[PDB]
């Protein structure tokens, strides 16, 4: 897990530095990150909501 985490971190570093590397304190990577967060959370919402929706079909007996 630790090594995998290290890997992911490095991948993030390479992607972020490659896409932009003359202003790492910029608002773009900011929007990217926050927006990714929102994507993930939205996915969570969608999936779990779908699960609950599925759970209702059981009561439809």
């Amino acid at each position: 897990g630790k090594d995998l985490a290290k890997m992911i971190k490095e991948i993030n570093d390479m992607s972020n530095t490659l896409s932009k590397g003359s202003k790492p304190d910029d608002p773009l990577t900011q929007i990217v990150r926050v927006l990714n967060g929102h994507l993930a959370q939205l996915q969570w919402i969608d999936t779990n909501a779908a699960a609950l929706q599925a759970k209702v079909a059981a009561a439809q007996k």
Partner: peptide
């Protein structure tokens, strides 16, 4: 650090 962060395999 930034070079390794923004690197592609």
């Amino acid at each position: 650090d930034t070079y390794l962060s923004n690197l592609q395999t």
